[PDB]
């Protein structure tokens, strides 16, 4: 039957002074609650271990580095992995990754897939970085992702997580059809990730009231056109004076939203998932092999 | 000159024996009404000169050929072009194209762009052909496009139509992000086309109640993610005992539906279009040059 | 905290020859699955024990009567109540009620609320009967609810079901704001019911493609304007050659759909429910006592 | 004569010191453009002659009074009426009404219907006043409508405007089914009005991202359940540092949105209206006389 129960663990705000230990307690509670409701996997938000630090311009590099993980998992996060293995529930965790390679301090906006045995099965590094690189005074709050992270270097992989083929996306990635399609072409049955999406956009404020719409539209369209179940976990609420979007969701291969959060705090939602459901699209209206004419899509891949 | 009024001329059913002369009378009426309401361009349906013949299994090539145009325009369709020039309103007309090359017949599901001077300024040939190849006895109506048409050989071009950069899609094409993206990368400000979409799908009837949803979801996502205005003109209603989807629409570059038809007969809808609105997406959240990482999209173009 | 887990048990078709015993097996499976996922209450469809008989014109009264329950519960349905008490999960069951009073054979389209102790806490009889009274040859299938049922005589009550105030609606009732408002004025925190909604409407077929839209619009609007959680359980799929609408759902007091079914078969969905959530609407934007001016609504109650 | 073209003239912000003469220039422009595109009636916003003054806590009655109209029309607004008669296009204008009766001041949030001859044919006074009564220090902006306006005393009338039966609602009124229903029971074919809806709500900010949703949900449900065309004209944009909702719209009696504004400035949208379309709902699924059971709706009218 190839069935499972997918869950999404939305997070309420994470204060700048909130410790990773405190955040892990909140993550543990949601993972535990999810498991008790039958979930075999739970998706957590992007950069789920800290406040969304890209909203500030840092002058002290040591301060910036404090928001990154140099180990995964480290002693502080270890408990989450142990509980995942115990209860047999995998998860997708987003965090800031700092790794020194060949004399370079590399920083990535990262996410990992952990199976029901508590083992890291795959990693993904955010490829589409939104925002800017330099401080901009006209903004009530910054979004320096291009300053704090370099574009991911692992491409868009699809991993075998227990019985499912899963692909990861991180926040802004969900808005790019290329990210979805590459993973769709790689057979992803589930495409999931998290996000920190302020409901106010300094550059184009006239789209503020469409924040929920644009988020859900991207999730629904991606799922439908690739015949993939999808899930998006947001960190929402008023975090350090910046309102973040909620509406975390789980979407069927038809693009139908099957589960949606309604609060702006830590919230768990679940939905029954039949991996064979993807066939309704992938063996018919979106039977890639039978319908696609790649000879005409060259421009999409031009450098 | 960055302002204009776009119109969609949805068609009601076209009977198997309804003549092109009769159909041209209907098209003339809609183009004339669109112009009277300020429109400078009107989008018509896919295969807008005949009934949707791909629903039948033909056994006589002469009968099949009767539904194709050997010239564009011929004496029968010429009046539409003359009226377009007269009133200063261009149009997108879909039709079945039959070409004879050195004794070889080429068949395409085609659409053309005509400017406000009544001159053909661009052509497109359906690349994504839906349906099946052989007669399937269980179906109340067939969908043999793969047998009656060859996949388009013009790619997804974008043409200058008066003061706008316009790209064309034909029916099923609207569900493929690759089609939208290629035209998006080519700077299309308006992406338009028509469609004949039965509200019943024999192989996957469990999606029948989602026909409107999938159609609108595709139009909205495509527009939003490419920062393009879009329009889709359907031929709707009970045509030869098969119910076709209505909900013809005009969409803003934000993915917002600005105009929608509510009947299943010939119906004109219009909407004010500012070509500079595209910038809200294309110079920011979807600033292609600044955010895309094409080195990771290669799989999309692999044959 | 006043929290609970609400569930909806959508039904696939029920054949005319399917026995109540067989249907009870299907109901038991969904109630059991719901309970295992934490649900404390599950909503079942309207007339959930038989095929939707109003689609046929009966000449034999004995045949018609066979579709009605003269006992509730009877030996056949007893198991459902016993399992509800055992697992501590209440339910809303719809069925055809036949009762002889004062020499009259009374027929109602009925629904009951059963608490987690397996006890019937309240009854409701469908007040808004759609359809017609006499056979109509132009219809591919009838909808003789006005012939087979008399309008409910219990008004729109709200009952205490365990820790929640619950109101019942039956199918067509969900489209009437009066039904929702009366129960809203009676403090309902949850408003639930089921439905058999063909996706084809003989009288006004031009609305067929809007069947899902009209259903969800009614559920969403009712919940929002009354600050009530709501749930609708449909019996969907191809039942005796008539396609019935799916999209069973659970909706928050804000009108946000939090759970939705995607198949057309027996399907269980659940959602976490916080009864205090109603306050976000009922103590503010929809604070009835502070905002309503009943002196101007008289016409709504005029006979 | 059952056909017409309805228009909505959405307004951008109106500054505190912006004069009525300047505002009339803006209204004239929209009414003129609507007429040039075929409209015979244009709906304008609630309190369309001034900034939304209820956002402030007034301490000087003379200052408060300055935002009200003592006559309608006065010399300043007269030009709009003359142009309406000239071009043959009626309108719905919202404004603050100040009436002096035997030394007693009466204050109302009012709207009037003017026909294509420039004659006032109907008035309505906002019955559902949102917000609070006293100054609340924590709010970035107040909403003291309950202090500056008395609930309307004209009920929810329906007037003959040229060839259409039209009913009026004002802002918050659109969220109350009782308002729509009374006009529905009175045969309204078009129910219209305007609004000033901040995208931020101080007491319940957790619904901020749902502002568009709740607005459109109310318009769609109201239209559908009363089989009425509807239109809502908002005054949108950043007005005096408070962001107001846009998404002005025209809706079919099916609840389908046929036209929607996408900017936050003065914007005209139009849509073809067939008054007989109402029959699709009112002579069938919502045939009031045949389906309603008012003897059970009594609680709705109880004082
Ligand atoms: N975390 C993250 O990527 N957030 C962005 C929000 C954003 C949009 C546009 C410009 C800047 C920032 C998102 O795409 O959801
Ligand atoms: N004309 C056209 O392309 N019609 C198809 C409908 C379709 C879908 C799937 C299978 C067969 C046919 C469309 O994509 O709108
Ligand atoms: N069971 C039930 O009430 N079904 C009706 C479907 C219907 C609509 C209109 C006319 C006739 C029948 C419903 O309102 O969902
Ligand atoms: N002008 C107007 O009525 N505005 C209100 C917005 C509102 C809601 C709730 C509380 C306060 C204010 C509206 O209902 O659209």
In the 3-class helix/strand/coil scheme, how is chain C assigned residue by residue?
CCEEEEEEEEECCCCCCCCHHHHHHHHHHHHHHHHHCCCCEEECCCCCCCCCHHHCCCCCHHHHHCCCECCCCCCCCHHHHHHHHHHCCEEEEEEEEEEEECCEEEEEEEEEEECCCCCEEEEEECCCCCCCCCCCCCCCCCCCHHHHCCCCCCCCCEEEECCEEEEECCHHHHHCHHHHHHHHHCCCCEEEEEECCECCCCCCHHHHHHHHHHHHHHHHHHHHHHCCEEEEEEECEEECCEEECCCCEEECCCCCEEEECCCCCCEEEEEEEEHHHHHHHHHHHCCHHHHCCHHHCHHHHCC
Containing H/E element for B28? helix B20-36
Report the C-alpha gap between B67 and B73 in whole angstroms. 14
Report the C-alpha gap between C200 and C187 in whole angstroms. 35
Lookup result for tokens 């006890």 = C119
Contact (CB, 8 A) for A249 and A231:
yes
Collapsing DSSP to helix, strand or coil, A245 comes out as coil
Ligand nearest to the CA of D286: 3
User: Beta-carbon neighbour count of residue C288 at 10 Å?
Assistant: 16
Lookup result for tokens 């009414």 = D31
Q: How many CB pairs under 8 A join C and D?
A: 147
Helices D20-36/D78-87 angle, 10° precision? 10
Contact (CB, 8 A) for C184 and C216:
no
List C-alpha distances in Å: B242 to B67, B142, B264.
18, 10, 13
Phi, psi for residue D200 in degrees, rounded to 5:
-125, 130
- Rounded to the nearest angstrom, the distance between the alpha carbon of D215 and the centre of ligand 3 is 27
Ligand 3, atom 9, lies closest to the CA of D285
Collapsing DSSP to helix, strand or coil, D253 comes out as coil
Q: Residue B5: name the closest of B44, B41, B43, B30 by CA.
A: B41
Burial letters D134-144, b for 16+ CB under 10 A, else e: eeeeebebbbb
Contact (CB, 8 A) for D178 and C176:
no
Report the C-alpha gap between A154 and A157 in whole angstroms. 7
Report the C-alpha gap between A265 and A246 in whole angstroms. 8
Phi, psi for residue B276 in degrees, rounded to 5:
-80, -10
Report the C-alpha gap between C45 and C95 in whole angstroms. 9
Report the C-alpha gap between C17 and C239 in whole angstroms. 11
Phi, psi for residue B237 in degrees, rounded to 5:
95, 180
Q: Which residues of C touch B206 (CB under 8 A)?
A: 263-264
- Rounded to the nearest angstrom, the distance between the alpha carbon of C217 and the centre of ligand 3 is 15
Question: What is the signed CA dihedral for A179, A183, A184, A188, rounded to 10 degrees?
Answer: -140
Ligand 3, atom 1, lies closest to the CA of C196
Greatest pairwise CA separation for chain B in angstroms:
55
Contact (CB, 8 A) for A107 and A208:
no
Atom of ligand 1 nearest to the CA of A172: 14
Phi, psi for residue A186 in degrees, rounded to 5:
-90, 15
Contact (CB, 8 A) for C192 and C166:
yes
Report the C-alpha gap between C287 and B180 in whole angstroms. 47
Task: Give how far the C-alpha of residue A277 lies from the chain's centroid of Cα atoms, to the nearest Å.
Answer: 22
**Following DSSP, what letter does each residue of B273-290 receive, concatenated?**
EEGGGGHHIIIIIT-HHH
Report the C-alpha gap between C209 and B244 in whole angstroms. 10
Output DSSP code: residue B231: E
Q: Residue A210: name the closest of D174, B77, D103, B255 by CA.
A: B255
Considering only the beta carbons, identify the residue of D206, D209, D243 that sits closest to A211.
D209
Considering only the beta carbons, identify the residue of A37, A258, A270 that sits closest to C262.
A258
- Report CB contact under 8 Å: A199, D208: yes
**CA torsion sign, C112 to C118 to C120 to C122?**
negative
Output DSSP code: residue A69: B
Cis peptide before B131 (omega within 30 of 0): no
Report the C-alpha gap between A170 and A145 in whole angstroms. 12
**CA torsion sign, B55 to B56 to B57 to B59?**
negative
Lookup result for tokens 């629409």 = B249
Contact (CB, 8 A) for B223 and B249:
no
Contact (CB, 8 A) for C168 and C111:
yes
- Report CB contact under 8 Å: C301, D297: yes
Phi, psi for residue D123 in degrees, rounded to 5:
-135, 155
- Rounded to the nearest angstrom, the distance between the alpha carbon of A62 and the centre of ligand 2 is 57
Ligand 4, atom 9, lies closest to the CA of C285
Pairing between β-strand B158-161 and β-strand B164-168 as defined by DSSP bridges: antiparallel
Contact (CB, 8 A) for C10 and C233:
yes
Report the C-alpha gap between D8 and D194 in whole angstroms. 9
Containing H/E element for A296? none
How many alpha carbons lie under 13 Å from residue B221 in its C-beta half-sphere? 30
Beta bridge partners of B270: B7
Contact (CB, 8 A) for A297 and B186:
no
List C-alpha distances in Å: D151 to B280, C283, D103, D129, D174.
42, 19, 20, 7, 15
Helices D177-185/D211-226 angle, 10° precision? 20
User: Beta-carbon neighbour count of residue B86 at 10 Å?
Assistant: 13
Collapsing DSSP to helix, strand or coil, D216 comes out as helix
Ligand nearest to the CA of A203: 1
Contact (CB, 8 A) for A258 and A8:
no
Q: CB neighbours of D99 closer than 8 A, spacing ≥ 6? A: D105, D106, D107, D108
Q: Residue D55: name the closest of D15, D92, D24, D27 by CA.
A: D15
Helices C78-87/C20-36 angle, 10° precision? 10
Burial letters A264-282, b for 16+ CB under 10 A, else e: bebbbbbbbbbbebbebbb
D215 to chain A: closest CA residue: A209
- Rounded to the nearest angstrom, the distance between the alpha carbon of B154 and the centre of ligand 1 is 36
Question: Residue D6: is it exposed, middle or buried by C-beta count within 10 angstroms (0-12/13-18/19+)?
Answer: buried
Lookup result for tokens 């004062």 = C102
Pairing between β-strand B267-274 and β-strand D229-234 as defined by DSSP bridges: unpaired
* Degrees to nearest 5, angle at CA D226 with C137 and D257: 100
Report the C-alpha gap between D99 and D102 in whole angstroms. 10
Contact (CB, 8 A) for C238 and C175:
no
Q: Residue A128: name the closest of A168, A186, A70 by CA.
A: A168
- Rounded to the nearest angstrom, the distance between the alpha carbon of D167 and the centre of ligand 4 is 20
Q: Which residues of D touch C286 (CB under 8 A)?
A: 175
Report the C-alpha gap between D212 and D209 in whole angstroms. 8
Containing H/E element for B116? none
Q: Which domains does chain D have, with CATH numbers?
A: 1-303 (3.60.110.10)
Rama region for D97: left / alpha / beta (φ>0; ψ in -120 to 50; rest): beta
Considering only the beta carbons, identify the residue of B260, B270, B272 that sits closest to D256.
B260
How many alpha carbons lie under 13 Å from residue D14 in its C-beta half-sphere? 26
Lookup result for tokens 């074919």 = D189
Phi, psi for residue B27 in degrees, rounded to 5:
-70, -40
**CA torsion sign, B208 to D280 to B266 to B91?**
negative
List C-alpha distances in Å: C206 to B48, B236, C289, D255, D285.
21, 11, 41, 14, 13
User: Beta-carbon neighbour count of residue A117 at 10 Å?
Assistant: 12
Tokens of A275: 């991996």
Question: Which of B195, B198, B206 has the most C C-beta neighbours within 10 Å, making it the best mutation to test the interface with C?
Answer: B206
Cis peptide before B37 (omega within 30 of 0): no
* Degrees to nearest 5, angle at CA C173 with C170 and C174: 95
Task: Confirm or reject: Cβ of B211 under 6 Å from ligand 2.
Answer: no
List C-alpha distances in Å: B193 to A276, A299, D302.
33, 21, 55
- Report CB contact under 8 Å: D217, C221: yes
- Report CB contact under 8 Å: C262, A269: no
* Degrees to nearest 5, angle at CA A73 with A69 and A77: 90
- Rounded to the nearest angstrom, the distance between the alpha carbon of B65 and the centre of ligand 3 is 45
Task: Give how far the C-alpha of residue B28 lies from the chain's centroid of Cα atoms, to the nearest Å.
Answer: 18
Question: What is the signed CA dihedral for B73, B76, B78, B83, rounded to 10 degrees?
Answer: -140
Contact (CB, 8 A) for C236 and C246:
yes
Contact (CB, 8 A) for C252 and C280:
no
Containing H/E element for D193? strand D190-195
Pairing between β-strand D90-101 and β-strand C104-114 as defined by DSSP bridges: unpaired
Ligand nearest to the CA of B146: 2
Tokens of D222: 């109201």
Q: CB neighbours of D212 closer than 8 A, spacing ≥ 6? A: A209, A210, A213, D245, D247
Report the C-alpha gap between A220 and B221 in whole angstroms. 9
Subunits that touch chain B (at least 3 Cβ pairs < 8 angstroms)?
A, C, D
List C-alpha distances in Å: B81 to B116, B125, C58.
9, 20, 59
Phi, psi for residue C185 in degrees, rounded to 5:
-70, -20
Ligand 2, atom 11, lies closest to the CA of B131
Q: CB neighbours of C127 closer than 8 A, spacing ≥ 6? A: C151, C152, C155, C156, C173, C179, D293, D296
3-state helix, strand, coil in chain B (%, to 5): 30, 30, 40
C289 to chain D: closest CA residue: D303
Output DSSP code: residue A54: G
- Rounded to the nearest angstrom, the distance between the alpha carbon of A91 and the centre of ligand 1 is 23
Tokens of B272: 């004010």
Q: Residue C272: name the closest of C33, C36, C10, C39 by CA.
A: C39
Report the C-alpha gap between A184 and A221 in whole angstroms. 13
Burial letters A134-164, b for 16+ CB under 10 A, else e: eeeeebeebbbbbbbbebbeebbbbbebeeb
Burial letters D25-46, b for 16+ CB under 10 A, else e: ebbeebbbbbbebbbbbbbbbb
Rama region for C20: left / alpha / beta (φ>0; ψ in -120 to 50; rest): alpha
Collapsing DSSP to helix, strand or coil, A24 comes out as helix
Report the C-alpha gap between B299 and C211 in whole angstroms. 39
Task: Confirm or reject: Cβ of A175 under 6 Å from ligand 1.
Answer: yes
Which residues have any ligand 4 atom within 6 Å of their CB? C 285; D 46, 130-131, 143, 171-172, 175, 195-197, 201
Pairing between β-strand B237-239 and β-strand B242-244 as defined by DSSP bridges: antiparallel
Q: How many CB pairs under 8 A join A and C?
A: 46
Task: Give how far the C-alpha of residue D238 lies from the chain's centroid of Cα atoms, to the nearest Å.
Answer: 19
Angstrom resolution of this structure: 1.8
Phi, psi for residue D209 in degrees, rounded to 5:
-70, -5
Q: Which residues of A touch C38 (CB under 8 A)?
A: 36-37
Lookup result for tokens 């007669």 = B135
Chain C residues at the B interface, defined by Cβ less than 8 Å, are: 199, 206, 208-213, 243, 245-247, 263-264
Report the C-alpha gap between C69 and C49 in whole angstroms. 9
**Following DSSP, what letter does each residue of D78-129 receive, concatenated?**
HHHHHHHHHHT-EEEEEEEEEEEETTEEEEEEEEEEE-TTS-EEEEEE----
Out of B195, B212, B214, B236, give the residue to mutate to test ligand 2, the one with the largest number of ligand atoms within 8 Å of its CB. B195
Pairing between β-strand A104-114 and β-strand A90-101 as defined by DSSP bridges: antiparallel
Q: CB neighbours of C24 closer than 8 A, spacing ≥ 6? A: C49, C76, C77, C79, C80
Containing H/E element for D184? helix D177-185
Report the C-alpha gap between A156 and D236 in whole angstroms. 41
């Amino acid at each position: 039957t190839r069935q499972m129960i997918l869950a999404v663990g939305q997070q309420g705000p994470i204060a700048r002074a909130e410790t990773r230990e405190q955040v892990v307690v909140r993550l543990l509670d949601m993972l535990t609650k999810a498991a008790s409701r039958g979930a075999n996997f739970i998706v957590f938000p992007e950069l789920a271990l800290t406040t969304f630090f890209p909203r500030w311009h840092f002058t002290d590099e040591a301060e910036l580095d404090s928001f990154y993980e140099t180990e995964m998992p480290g002693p502080v996060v270890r408990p989450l992995f142990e509980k995942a293995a115990e209860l047999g529930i995998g998860f997708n965790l987003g965090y800031a990754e700092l790794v020194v390679e060949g004399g370079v301090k590399r920083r990535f906006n990262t996410s990992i897939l952990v199976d029901k045995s508590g083992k890291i099965v795959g990693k993904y590094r955010k490829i589409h970085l939104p925002g800017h690189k330099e401080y901009e005074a006209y903004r009530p709050f910054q979004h320096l992702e291009k300053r704090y992270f370099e574009p991911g270097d692992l491409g868009f992989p699809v991993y075998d997580v227990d019985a499912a083929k899963m692909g990861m996306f991180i926040a802004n990635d969900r808005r790019w059809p290329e990210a979805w399609r590459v993973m769709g072409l790689r057979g992803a049955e589930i495409i999931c990730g998290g996000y920190n999406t302020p409901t106010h956009n300094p550059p184009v404020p006239q789209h503020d009231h469409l924040t929920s719409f644009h988020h859900l539209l991207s999730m629904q369209a991606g799922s439908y056109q690739n015949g993939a179940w999808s899930a998006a976990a947001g960190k929402a609420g008023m975090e350090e004076n910046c309102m973040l979007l909620g509406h975390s969701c789980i979407v069927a291969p038809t693009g139908e939203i099957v589960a949606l959060t309604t609060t702006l705090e830590d919230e768990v939602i679940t939905a029954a998932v039949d991996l064979d459901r993807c066939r309704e699209l992938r063996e018919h209206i979106f039977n890639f092999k039978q319908h696609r004419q790649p000879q005409h899509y060259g421009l999409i891949a031009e450098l």
